[PDB]
């Protein structure tokens, strides 16, 4: 019953900026960590960044590191990308997720709840 839903993806030309959202169908006693994910056709879906519940702790992906900024609202179980200097190889479908452990967020199976995705594409 849990649902969560991104918004915000778009089709737009290398080196601009897109904001991705996501926001749960409710609050939780303590907040979940949240994440993004992205699949492209060809690859595993990989992890792009995550949160843990209080909005300490983030981490990126190796190759979005320093481009895209991962944030939440305090207390809401919401979760925000900012994608600066977007490349090509950013193209994908992109999926928030929600985990109750900060540190599983970041694995393919770690996550309690998966958004639908966001389809993110940028051209050349």
């Known amino acids: 019953q849990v649902q969560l839903v991104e918004s915000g993806g778009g089709l737009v030309q290398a080196g601009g900026s897109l904001r991705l959202s996501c926001a749960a169908s409710?609050?939780?006693?303590?907040?979940?960590?949240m994440a993004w994910f992205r699949q492209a056709p060809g690859k595993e879906r990989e992890f792009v960044a995550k949160?843990?519940?209080?909005?300490?702790?983030?981490t990126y992906g190796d190759s979005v590191k320093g481009r895209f900024t991962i944030s939440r609202d305090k207390g809401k179980n919401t979760v925000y990308l900012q994608m600066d200097s977007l490349k090509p190889e950013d193209t994908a479908v992109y999926y928030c997720?929600?985990?109750?452990?900060?540190?599983?967020?970041?694995?393919?199976?770690?996550?309690?709840?998966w958004g639908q995705g966001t389809q993110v594409t940028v051209s050349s």
């Open positions: 949160i843990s519940g209080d909005g300490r702790l983030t």
């Open positions: 997720a929600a985990d109750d452990n900060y540190v599983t967020a970041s694995w393919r199976s770690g996550p309690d709840y």
């Open positions: 409710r609050r939780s006693s303590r907040s979940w960590a």
